[model samples]
Target: TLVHVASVEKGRSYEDFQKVYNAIALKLREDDEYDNYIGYGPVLVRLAWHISGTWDKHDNTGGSYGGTYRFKKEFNDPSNAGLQNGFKFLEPIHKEFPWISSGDLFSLGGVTAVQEMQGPKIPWRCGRVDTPEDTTPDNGRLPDADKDAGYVRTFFQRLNMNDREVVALMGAHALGKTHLKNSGYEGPGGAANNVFTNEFYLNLLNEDWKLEKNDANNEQWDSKSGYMMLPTDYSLIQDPKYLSIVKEYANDQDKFFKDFSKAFEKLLEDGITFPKDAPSPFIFKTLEEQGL
Candidate 1:
């Protein structure tokens, strides 16, 4: 199953993408003032997920392969309200690394953000071709923050994620707070918003959450520690199956990192196929590794 339909940019190599990675890593450091000094890490990962999550395993119409997020309609998706910050952050990177496809840059932006934030090492490949505006999937394909366990399970089925994968990926909630104006949800999931950890799982299990409505009138689980969980986030504890994995991750950071690495890789690669000749996935050198 050769999925290398898109042409690789002329004369690209490992170092080429490495350079792109470094550029993104560098900006992530320089842009410390954004998001109340949480920087752009979390939103970058969210952008990658939203772009890739559009993929429907049935038809493959919306996925990272097309990078149609550059289009106006997809950019304006109500679900994508707060993501322009990530896109604008990547704009200069795109301009500098014009050879990389939009899908590649977008997905890699996530990979870089994660690792630079001390998260797991997510292997990534590059072959996404730039797609036109017409290729954009309709709006509202992303998940609703206010949904439940069943809806969460069914929603991810469209992306081919299983219970474990869904639980592992949601561990990312530890990294960012919900903005009142953005999703009508509020507060950080835990104290460590810039660094990735199993804190989301830890908080869910340890916190004494109260069912409360925010100023937006949406129901969310709020704790006195100033952490909050979405209805969808709270679903992990409500469902017995999800509860088990959440406990495992909370108990073991390494397990969560490993599971999340695999799930995140799969999420980033969802609709694309790699030809046998395609370069093997790249494990980029972090800025610290490169002595930057």
Candidate 2:
């Protein structure tokens, strides 16, 4: 968005690349199942988060760029284990739309995945180039599931996020579940695992969760029936400041949606400065918008 030169190719002309968009849009429609999973959207959203979450404010080196996940080093990253399903979902699309850069494809995959999953509209722009494998971020940059409120408060600062931003971003827990196989954490965050809503906060307040270890032995908040929340998530309840915001979202869906839209847009655009001329925000409709 800024005047700086792009890391990857500027991009194909809009006319040239609309085909890539159509291809990705259609493939996202056609290949709707993996591991008998109804949609790859959730994991794909998580994939985008994992890649972008690597950015450290002190040094802007690592981020969604590089498409480093394609390399074995980033592929087998511990925080990324269960994401092979996300990578697998993108493979055929990559084969079909070979002209697009990995950074563009991966980031767009996240945008498309979130919208299709019933989350807020995220404005997406494409101009990232895939960097070399050596540029892959070191492991352990991700938030630890078993940490405390101060830990959560301290951790997100490296990414330049504040308390409200942190609460809003974590609200994305509305979209995906934690897989024991992936982060040694397990289960959907709420009853509507596949739908996007402020139900995470509602459930946190309503559910009578018991503390238990998963098959992986990681401590997580669990209901008698087995849904899970990480220690960091529960820490939200313990901290007076965080608990206030969490409770607000729990009670107000409209407010939750409004705040979340602003926060997530910021999360996706770390380090990149948008020129005043860039589109305000391009809201794309999902295939469902076409009665699919």
Candidate 3:
């Protein structure tokens, strides 16, 4: 049994990665017309999650370790429909920094997106080597938006995520809208779609949502304030256990940020074993930190 090792790029260090981070952050700031000006942050976050979410802990068949999304089979995943914009967004960055592995670039793009969106600082580790197409995981591993709390719970267990981690990760829904063409759902989950917040939990807890079908004919919860929630999202409040965690995040922004930071890092790191002597995970400086 071969293990996926975290092998840092030849002589690469924190500053090297910071440069890549800076590039991604700059593009995020400059590219403002994407998705009705909601920008690429949300989609990048989705890209990262979808890439890593394919893991099955029992056999480690699919995961961020392979960076398999570059291949058409994984790239064309219906669940990954809207993420092409994110890949195009990063195309130039990859061209500029050709040494960065596909897996590393994809995951780092996600970390950069979250932090730049005023979300949590997701500590990132680099060393994901791209594997051949044979290593690419099959599609259909991602969760469905039209499901219940039980499905959400069971779906994440394959990736080893518990209840709190599930809720923490779902808070990202606050960052983007569901495009009918992409996911067969509609509308933004919050007011400031580009800037991340605990809006998903707050809206779920406060909004009087109505279950209805959209033009795509898929069922979603709608609010009078022009907000919408997928069945998987509304399921948070429906389940007693997930409800408590959602309330905790809604009540405490700091707690949500911290939990999300850890959980996100764990999500990206799954399926790879970093050698003890490898460099520590890099907590990059946001553009705000650099006064950019």
Candidate 4:
């Protein structure tokens, strides 16, 4: 029942993306100094979300399908303040494989980072086409760091995500830190910022959080373990519905990985209508899987 087939990049095959993944994975291991030694994994995940999260389910504008983030306006959006690092990291990969679309590279960087860091296997598809500057999404479509549970729920609805999907996606906070300069919040969400685990949910359920304003006057949940949770991150526990899902993920690691994988793939596929002839998604092997 594949109603819509997505056009693949000309003459590309699975090996091409695997090669790009290898390049990105190699860089992640080499670029150990990025973001205070957390490496580029977390920010790469953030970059993917930021790029795909711009989609509006109603009109289908501002999705990763257009590769609009390469434009100066989209790259300079206030919400994307700290993502320049992720973008810069991929520049070399894009140059080496100049045929890949910006949208595909940006999104694939996230997939590679997740798998290489021992996270779940994200099935990826490449059909994104680069568009002109006019297709760039306007600023403010991204979520805010200062929002509450209600706001979080409402905001994701723009992308047609449900409560379960929103909670599953936020589990990615486990991978990266919140830079004080970047998002007006400081500290990592958990102790294992470089590894993908259920630590975000575990921390939320286990930590003794102090609701305090950061230097930027943004209220965030801070813990004694040098971890911080944004208002939106904390909202998962505040809302009863999201709390149940959070607890489920915290108690079960395998379940979290499975759900996160599904939600992430769906998030990346937003606004995309693959044709009947489109290639099926690819589940890439990790460097570990390849014995590299």
Candidate 5:
């Protein structure tokens, strides 16, 4: 059902769009002063994941579509338990720039938050159309933490990602910790919890981690904090194939960044088709660059 509109937004230029990028980046800096325990970095990555995670490879339905998470029903989704922090952080930015589509805001918030928090360079695009409420994907599309590598492997297949892509994404666990109240899991991945790096992989290899049940009666990593890891995060180390890539990433931060950026970009654009020359894509600068 290819429908043509009278006209589509030509989109702001790289120079003009710098204003919006800066606004999002500035807000991220301010929000970072607190919430370091539950860092904005991980949840922002989760926000991007939750939005783009809905892609159904069968017919290209669901996935950052209509940017429906902006609405209450989508935001309140139980699967999105801990993402409220990300939404609240982005709310003021949305109000300030009311004209940007929710897709752009959510996606941009992710890239900006990651870069500001010292994560990789995630190149982004901006032509996603907002869909109506009825188009929302049913709950539980997100991966479960307590699951095994088999479950992880089975689940991501629906999203059309291969083993390499799966390993790369799990590297993002370095960005944030799991919450017992939010997802029945707990704990941060590394000491560099807020700052992104290959620390997740390094910790996976170097830490003297033990599998212990939390007060919530769920098994997760315990470093004294109630924070946790869904068993699947650790499974990356147990499985030889997955661990090979994990070890590689742990040894090289630059390699991890490049792989993550490519995989994440693919995840965001899943199930959508674009004609050639649609646009070359934009890599925006931070609010610091704008002097805002």
Candidate 6:
């Protein structure tokens, strides 16, 4: 019965973490040609999700608390196929601020990416210490894109996320296009490449998706508009329970943003317990706010 506790670095405060965040935000603004000019925002979001999504609540075996993704075993997980780009993206930040923990740096990169992209403010807490390589969770814990609604439902339950939370989190799909070389899926979930918008739900509900198997021979929903949905994504519209939440998010951007902020935060915080006096999460000022 060991509980992972949130332990802030000795005397480090918001300003310290703020500097780290600003570095990440600045690089995001400068490095603007990734993913075919889409920038690294989406992949940073994917990195954050993949790192945190491996949690198995039942056994408390995997989660972002360990920062184990640095290990070869976890980094090479096929489920993490294309996330190496994000790891490399953050390499310099880690080098510059050698004090930041891997767990904190990895998670903060995602928060910085989201806010810098004009997405919602994701309140983030610091103080996740890195663990040894042996602590890394085995691969295969991440979700597959080719599954159905029921499968999506069951899979997310392992993370203790309910339907609305699941729907809110998926709103991120609007941020980036999927690559066939990376995940065997192709096309953007929405028209915009880098900004985080409610278009994930908007496009899912609006498109009359023709079920098409990609060149990878995987089934996915396609639109003549040149957009596409992974089977697991389309399942949101197919399931009665999930459809309601998806539509709610599609229609209300603020509500979706707020809910996503909560869910994404919770996803990253899953395996750790915070003391009552733990510092309140920091809502970072975007690069624009700092007038950079």
- Summed over model 3, clashes come to 0
For model 4, residues 1-292, the per-residue Cα lDDT tens digits are 1122256899898998898899899899999998788999998999999999999887888888888988888899989989999999999999999999988999999999999889999999998887778978899899997778999999999998999899999999998888878778888888888999999999999999999888988788899887899988988898999999999999999999999999998898888888878888988888778887
Estimate TM-scores for all models: 0.98, 0.89, 0.99, 0.97, 0.91, 0.98
Q: What clash count goes with each model? A: 0, 1, 0, 7, 7, 0
- The full ranking of all candidates by lDDT, starting with the best, is 3, 1, 6, 4, 5, 2
Model 2: per-residue Cα lDDT over 144-192, one tens digit each? 7788999999999988889988988888786668766667787887767
Show where candidate 3 strays beyond 4 Å: none
* lDDT score of residue 22 within candidate 1: 98
lDDT (tens digit, per residue) of candidate 1 on 1-292 = 2242645667788899999999999999998999899999999999999999998888788989899999989999989989999999999999998889999999999999999999999999888898778889999889998888999999999999999999999999999789988888888999999998899999999999999999999999999999999999999999999999999999999999999999999999988877768788889999999999
Clashing pairs in 5: 66-130, 66-131, 145-230, 186-227, 186-228, 187-227, 187-228
What TM-score number comes out for model 1?
0.98
User: How many backbone collisions does model 1 have?
Assistant: 0
Name the regions of candidate 6 deviating beyond 4 angstroms.
none
lDDT agreement of model 2 with the native: 0.74
| Residue 147 Cα positional deviation in candidate 3, in Å, after optimal superposition | 1.0
| Candidate 4 ranges with C-alpha deviation above 4 Å | 1-5
Quick one: ranking by TM-score, best first?
3, 6, 1, 4, 5, 2
lDDT of 5 by residue, 155-248 (tens): 9999999988999988888877776799887667777777778887888887767789887898876554333456898888778889898899
Cα-based lDDT at residue 69, candidate 1: 93
| Candidate 3 residue-wise lDDT, 68-154, digit = tens | 999999999998998999999999999999999999999999999999988888889999999999999899999998899999999
- Assess the local accuracy of residue 23 in candidate 4 as a C-alpha lDDT between 0 and 100: 88
Q: 5 or 6, which is superior by lDDT?
A: 6
lDDT of the candidates, in the order given: 0.93, 0.74, 0.93, 0.89, 0.76, 0.90
Q: Which pairs clash (backbone N, Cα, C closer than 3 Å) in model 3? A: none
